[PDB]
Structure 1
Amino acid sequence: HHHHTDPEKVEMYIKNLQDDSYYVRRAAAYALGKIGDERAVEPLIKALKDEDAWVRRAAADALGQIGDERAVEPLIKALKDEDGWVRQSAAVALGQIGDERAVEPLIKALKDEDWFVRIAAAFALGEIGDERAVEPLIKALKDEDGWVRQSAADALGEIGGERVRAAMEKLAETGTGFARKVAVNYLETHK
């Protein structure tokens, strides 16, 4: 890395975002994410509306890797995409960008019908590190999906702070099952 961006290469891939082939558009989004240059942001925001879900997924991933805050509002809209894997990608991307504007929408995604979206929402909330997400993550310790539970537990640990500690104490006192184990372990290992 630490590459100086080759303008001809970026221009080439940006143009390929308009190719007739979904594969070429997908590959261009992927390439642009790896290059990491902000010239790609507005073109990728458009690709985030591509007719092909595979292209939309790749565009969200690339926007996350570039990390430009102009992507936040469009990715927030992508959290409502009809395609579950696009929502998952948008959640992951928003986590990577780290912008607090994504917190409320991600909390909503914690209730998504798809388990893989919920995992990504939990993870992203952990990465952003905003205490706002404590109660929603606490509730996710009761999720039907065991991986979602685990991701929420990890996210609480990433956020840390007094509010998490206070919530863990309540669970330590009166919680049961997985949530209790999470809380007791947390308190034993923290401060």
Structure 2
Amino acid sequence: KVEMYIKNLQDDSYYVRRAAAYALGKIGDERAVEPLIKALKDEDAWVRRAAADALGQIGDERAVEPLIKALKDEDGWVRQSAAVALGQIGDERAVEPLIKALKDEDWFVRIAAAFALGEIGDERAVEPLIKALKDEDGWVRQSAADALGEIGGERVRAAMEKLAETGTGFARKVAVNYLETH
């Protein structure tokens, strides 16, 4: 029963809270939303990440600001799942925090931020995602390219024309392909 789990989320055994979190997500009702938001502050990083992940699957906008704060979690993997969850939700309040996350320490979270930014589809990400095309990590470059395509639209096309004309390297290839394929 979700209220058992909702209560389990406070158990002394991190092993039990871990199980609660993962569960409240697979079978998530709105009842689970507020408890899970509290679990984003759990001592155990696993619990945090399972909570971020659940809340994304639930889709309730109440989690938006609490997740935005998790984009600053000590653990890179929970930041990763926060970014993804924000993407899923996907409230436009996440946009600017997610754009800041494009410069995260961990490549795997920069990928998540680009992906989320693309899912949300707010053109504010266009310029930051273009800069992300010159990221030191080749897989986040890739994820920045994919996100731009997911966003689509006039500002992206315009930004791509710019790059096709005077840009270079991966960015140029991305832009030439973009307008080739539209």
What TM-score results when the alignment is normalised by the length of structure 1? 0.93
CA RMSD of aligned residues (A): 0.7
Q: Deviations over 1:80-121 (max 9, x none)?
A: 111111111110000000100000000000001110110000
Pairwise CA distance, 1:148 = 0.4
Equivalent in the alignment of 1:38: 30
Indicate whether 1:122 and 2:110 are aligned.
no
- Residue 174 of structure 2: aligned partner: 182
Q: Deviations over 1:24-50 (max 9, x none)?
A: 211211111111211001100110000
1:186 positional shift: 0.5
- Residue 14 (structure 1) shift: 1.0
Percent identity (aligned):
100
Q: Which runs of 5+ in 2 are unaligned?
A: none
User: What residue number does 2:131 align with?
Assistant: 139
Could you tell me how far 1:11 is from its partner in structure 2? 1.3
Question: What's the offset of the Cα at 1:54?
Answer: 1.0
How far apart are residue 22 of structure 1 and its match?
Answer: 1.3
Give the total of aligned pairs. 182
Of 81, 84, 93, the residue aligned with 2:76 is 84
C-alpha distance in 2 between matches for 1:97 and 1:187: 30
Q: Secondary structure at the match of 1:12?
A: helix
Q: Secondary structure at the match of 2:134?
A: coil
Helix, strand or coil for the counterpart of 2:170?
Answer: helix
Secondary structure of the residue aligned to 1:141 is helix
Q: Secondary structure at the match of 1:125?
A: helix
Question: What are the superposed Cα offsets for residues 162-182 of structure 1, whole Å, 9 maximum, x if unpaired?
Answer: 000001001101111111110
Runs (5+) with no aligned partner, structure 1 = 1-8
Alpha-carbon separation, structure 1, partners of 2:28 and 2:7: 16
Inter-partner Cα distance in structure 2 for 1:66 and 1:22? 23
Q: Give every structure 1 segment of 4 or more consecutive aligned residues whose post-TM-superposition deviation is greater than 2 Å.
A: none
